[PDB]
Assembly symmetry: C4
Homo-oligomer: 459 residues x 4
Amino acid sequence: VSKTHSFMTVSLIELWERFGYYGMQALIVYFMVQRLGFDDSRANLVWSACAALIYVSPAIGGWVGDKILGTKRTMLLGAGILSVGYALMTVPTENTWFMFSALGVIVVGNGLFKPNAGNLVRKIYESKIDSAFTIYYMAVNVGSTFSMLLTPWIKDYVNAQYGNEFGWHAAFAVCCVGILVGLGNYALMHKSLANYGSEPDTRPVNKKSLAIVLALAALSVVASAIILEYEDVARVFVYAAGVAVLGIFFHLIRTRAGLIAALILTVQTVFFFIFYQQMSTSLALFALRNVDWDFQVFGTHLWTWSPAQFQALNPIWIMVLSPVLAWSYSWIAAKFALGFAVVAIGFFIYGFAGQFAVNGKTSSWVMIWGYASYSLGELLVSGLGLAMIGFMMGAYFVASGISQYLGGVVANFASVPQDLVDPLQTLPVYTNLFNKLGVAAVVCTIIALAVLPLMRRLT
Amino acid sequence: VSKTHSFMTVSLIELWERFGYYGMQALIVYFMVQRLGFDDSRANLVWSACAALIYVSPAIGGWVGDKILGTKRTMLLGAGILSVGYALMTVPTENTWFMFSALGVIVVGNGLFKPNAGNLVRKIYESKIDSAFTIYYMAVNVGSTFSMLLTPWIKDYVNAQYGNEFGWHAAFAVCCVGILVGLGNYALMHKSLANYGSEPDTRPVNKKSLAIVLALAALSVVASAIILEYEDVARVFVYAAGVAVLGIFFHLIRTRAGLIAALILTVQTVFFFIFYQQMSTSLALFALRNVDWDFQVFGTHLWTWSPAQFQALNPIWIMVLSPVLAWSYSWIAAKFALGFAVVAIGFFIYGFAGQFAVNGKTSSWVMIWGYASYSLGELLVSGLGLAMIGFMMGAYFVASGISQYLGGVVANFASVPQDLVDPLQTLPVYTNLFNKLGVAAVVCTIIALAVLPLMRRLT
Amino acid sequence: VSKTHSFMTVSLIELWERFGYYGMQALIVYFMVQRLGFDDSRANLVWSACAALIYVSPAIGGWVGDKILGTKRTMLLGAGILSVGYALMTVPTENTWFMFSALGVIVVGNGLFKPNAGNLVRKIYESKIDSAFTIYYMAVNVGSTFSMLLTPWIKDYVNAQYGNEFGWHAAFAVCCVGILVGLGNYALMHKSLANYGSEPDTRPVNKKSLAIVLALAALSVVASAIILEYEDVARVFVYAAGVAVLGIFFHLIRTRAGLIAALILTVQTVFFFIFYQQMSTSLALFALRNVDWDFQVFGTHLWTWSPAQFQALNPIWIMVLSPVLAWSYSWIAAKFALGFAVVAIGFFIYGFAGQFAVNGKTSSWVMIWGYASYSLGELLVSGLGLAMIGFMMGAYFVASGISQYLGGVVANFASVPQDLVDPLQTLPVYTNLFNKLGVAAVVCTIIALAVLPLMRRLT
Amino acid sequence: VSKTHSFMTVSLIELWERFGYYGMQALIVYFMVQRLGFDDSRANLVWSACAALIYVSPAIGGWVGDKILGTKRTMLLGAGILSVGYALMTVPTENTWFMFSALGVIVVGNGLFKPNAGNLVRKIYESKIDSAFTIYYMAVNVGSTFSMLLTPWIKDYVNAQYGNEFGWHAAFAVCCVGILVGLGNYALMHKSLANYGSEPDTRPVNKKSLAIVLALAALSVVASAIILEYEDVARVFVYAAGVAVLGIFFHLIRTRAGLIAALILTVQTVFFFIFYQQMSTSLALFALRNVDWDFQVFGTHLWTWSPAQFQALNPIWIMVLSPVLAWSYSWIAAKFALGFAVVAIGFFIYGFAGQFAVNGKTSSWVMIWGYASYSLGELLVSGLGLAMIGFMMGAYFVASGISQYLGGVVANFASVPQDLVDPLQTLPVYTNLFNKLGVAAVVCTIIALAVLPLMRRLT
């Protein structure tokens, strides 16, 4: 059977999509800060609310893909939407509502693409879906590594040779043409995926449901752009969703043994996403303003970084360490506590950066060993949401999304005013946040290690 | 079966009791030194004799709880006695006999409460009593951590805002209201524990035995207060009990193979409690006078300690390391020698403190890594008294109690005269004691490692 | 059965052959640089093309030994040819075509000797041939260690006592008399090997095939000497063979699942031989010009090295670490990635050399810990060519041979002009190459670790 | 059965004998150097020849104990002889022939005591003789630790309070009274050992054989004293015995497969005893002249050593590490190579001593970590002589004895003239020998690791 070839086609279009998205993510925070005139305290909250929307969007799109429309065409619909989003990013305007419209289109497109691509990957292998998903996630990592290394250098190079604006928007065009390369790749190789489909893909398209989801997608783009623009609207929406999550838990508390364990596991999940969201927010600003991009090994100049390419170390270390864990596992929710400790030593790595290297900017090795620890923790604490316990799955998804925004306000603890360009004075606020955050992660380690007898009670 | 809920009620009242006791223990030595005018050489011996009485008191109370009175009501009787004790602590007097009366009431109350709470925990699960006891000890640790972090800060804060006296006595009132919160919690949830009882709890109360134990408790409070007040009385009582222990051993030597192994295991037990008692006595004084409470990680100010809150690191590290040992044990009285070595490296940690940090006061990280080692040793050498071999159980209990006092006189090797306020000059005596104590613990490591062939002979 | 004794005789003649060859290899690069007037950029390429010819020569000789002539007499023919080669090396001339003729004779002699000696070692044990081959490779290592320690010291000593020329040519005579000692040893003990033979050894010699291979050997010596002399001829031949390897792969791509895994394993093989060839080329020059041969341990003078004796650390560490791996393996193409990482840390060892020791010349411990890492990697990534998948075996052999030359041009990245005798200025170019090469090996580690899911797909 | 009690009586008399012997050994080298006027180059050779005689003496005594006389009475005869020896040591004379007579009496007494005590320990348990021998060796270690800590301090104290002579001779009287305490202990508890005996102990004493062994013992005392006195006589005797060992090997080479493996194992045995003998010879002189006896841990004065008490670290570390190996072995002649490497790092510890501490005298921690490594190697390479292959057992015993003397001449590489009292100038010769000896031990590690395929061939 050539089910491997159907898996190759979906892996190719998925690789190019993650190419487009992560080539955009590595630059979006620097884009709001440098090109746009946003102060970092607002760019942190705007990206964080957008990260929450992007994270919880696949739930709606995954249900639309198998119950309302076809999984194949809903994935293609989200791909074309993401094409519109990155093409909206590439027009040279200083308009806030322009980027906000592009970010809302990105939210809807991600939600309609990602879960359906992973859905039919499950469909192809009917249970070695784990074997396919491993190669699937590997193609995702190598594609995001290419983009996160490429699009920031395109930004630097195009701005250097062509002045001021063309850099950022050429990199966003690179994300757009990456989506179009994957769509052209799909238009050529869709024959293998034609056999495996969703429940509605057996039948032709329903234009009622198509017009419904298209008008709702536009209505969802407007809703997401307004949530991003006005920060106070994002706060009330996060608070209302927080009361909703607290409601679902207390409502189910009324029944209820063993769910208190999942409740605890959800509490730690919120703590975890406050740490992991930091590496995209304040750590990016820290790398932008307080890291010497001059990378030299043992006194020899190799290259000079671009502060966005640092985020490419998250996929790299994943591909470096995921085989390490496999063999090391060969030769139990307490592995949360291990991730808490590894996140702690990662923040303490950034606090260490203050000691050894002081010029206003710490060394660049800080980013390497840092992302090593962060990705290591992320490696061994990811997938806990899949092992929960249906109605609670929503509460977990919303809780994780809310924690993306809450981590964004935690990054505001190290927000630098835009009148402070001295890196000698911006280093304290960064190292202070990271040091006390590492203390908070050691606290979380103590919490999970002390609460382990509760977990062993529940088994 | 909801036997879990009966276990939750006893765990709640036990947590609040250990809350009261350890909120009092963390401050009692500093209370005798700072508020009361005791020189440290006397405060060391008075607490050490009180620690001996508190340690061997559960033997009498555990027998009274199942043979004379009801285990439930004897536990409640000890709880009300401990309420009187901490309420006696909270009245603002500089009277020595006031604190001594409170400490004697504490001895009787601990003896009548602790073994009966643990007794009916055994009763509830009739043999997963190990599973219950693990969650039981976990609730004990988290409650003592709260108190040992809270009551010293209450002392600092209330003294800062209200002058001189109210601080210490408010913290002792916090211990008292903690006992009352647990008693109110018991008065509401005693329905679950009503089914499981002792042998006399099947029958109503006997007022003859009640009047006997109440008059004897008062007579025991007077006896304990007099043992504490006059140090020479405590010496003769320890010596007579020492001759008694030596008597029981030689009397049983007359018979007698394999008991010589328990005799050796009792000898090491005496050595061990001389080390572990030190961390409550001289290490507290050392933290009071020669540790910089300014806690900063990598050059960032987090907080400033209170020298009593350092003892909260003993329960913390226990909850941190008891899961570590579990997995590390997955992937034999010689584990005594391991504890000897870990105690040794703990004393050598405090000796190291002299080198790196000298301002008159060593760094505060000394307390962290120290209590890590001490609790680690305590972790892997606790419970050896439960595996002995009945008549010898008394000799082991008395030997361990006597060793609490002997460790108190060992702490007098580093007793500072009260005319020496220069920390530059109080650092030598502390570091010298801790360094030669670490040498003594390495000697004990050599002893147990060399005597292991005797142990293998006995199996 | 005394098959052990037949194995001892072939092991003795093999030991003396590797004695001759490695006593010549350790000096050949220094011979082209110091005695001959070659600039290092040419001596690197000439040796590298010769290393490619020597590496792929056993394929032709192994087929001639069992299909055309007798394995015993073809091995003896190659031994006598190698005798002529080293005797050609020992005549004192500054003639380029003299050394080139000697090197071509060495290529033909190695090809006709080595695979047939190993072939009849397989013949003797018909499957404990692994047990014999382990002792076989051990005798090879100890013999090469003797020569690589002896012949460079003979060069130093004879030049010191006898002027200028006699040193290098006496060491090449030592290689020649070493071949003659093994041939005399064979002429005495060939009775044991007379029973075990090849397919033609059952029958007497065919003089047609003998005259064919002798005229072709002379024609092969001329072809090899011309490939070595003119560098541009070596480039075109490597390029044509590269197109041939690319041809074989694409031709077999037309069919073809699982061969893509061997294709990937061939790609890494090319990368690996670019690293391992470096230790014979630039590392030799680095040891010649930027390593303090004064070897002192903890401030005590032991000896002063000769820069060629450093290559004797490759066999030494092999015999030191091959038992280590055996027990460590007791108590999966990803072991390529492990070798990539160990090669990386080996190059970073040489980059470290710049920091600690600067006098123009780094310490000599650099060579020790370096060759430890290089031989460790070589240890755990050797033998992958034997596990391939017949027609592709040629493509793998040619690819590895081509990579020997490509590693030689990579060594030209650190080629020093002959007008630059200041070691203070030759240290940068060496340390810079080794540091960026270590970066390239970390890149290869990331490649193999990320591509591992492809390997697990193929099993 | 109370066979344990018979084992306790022999363990008590054995403990007191090793008490006497090691209380004498720790001082004998310093006695020849300090009290007697021997230059160290002669005291090294005299002790080394005496160590050879003491090592090979148990062979004759063990055969006399079970074939000629009774094992019990031959052991008692050797005990009374050793009593005469140490009593001969305790008379205050500067006479060379006095000490030589005492040393010869020690050789005969050790030979007649030690193997028979161990022989009837085998007799008592008829195969848990391993369990008995472990407790047996433990009693030996703890007794030698007491003596090696006691008798050097007796020497220091008695010389300080009583002038000049009484110190050394009081410590030798301590060794004598230690033998007499064990003999008095035996005279009281010999009832248990009366049941278990040798083959002749069934029958009464034979006065012919008694007079034979007594006259031969006196003749052996004269022969040993003359071998010790004139160094050239010791050389010729060692050379003749060396030719004898070489003879036995070549004579057995004439037959002979697998014995070549024991031949190799004997070669390494000679190398090993050259290293281990060093720690009693030059390391003692080094500790006497170039080690600061001031022992302080982390800046606190504990005590000041006596340079002979350093040898008590050999039994201590054995009792510390023999349990370590047991558990570490739970969770193959190549363990020779491991001992070679551990001996190497031990010599490199002493070479390290030159770097950190220079006042003319290195730190005292050098002796601690040194003897840790030496005893560790000794731990895991002892007992290889018991696993040989009868007629060769003699060759192995003589080879090990000869290597004791050869190690004594190796110690003469660091012999200091008696006109050089400056420790600033005696430190180089010691550190130079130890550093190049560590290099020699690394060479031995390479030898055994490279020769391991020969060992695997023989199994």
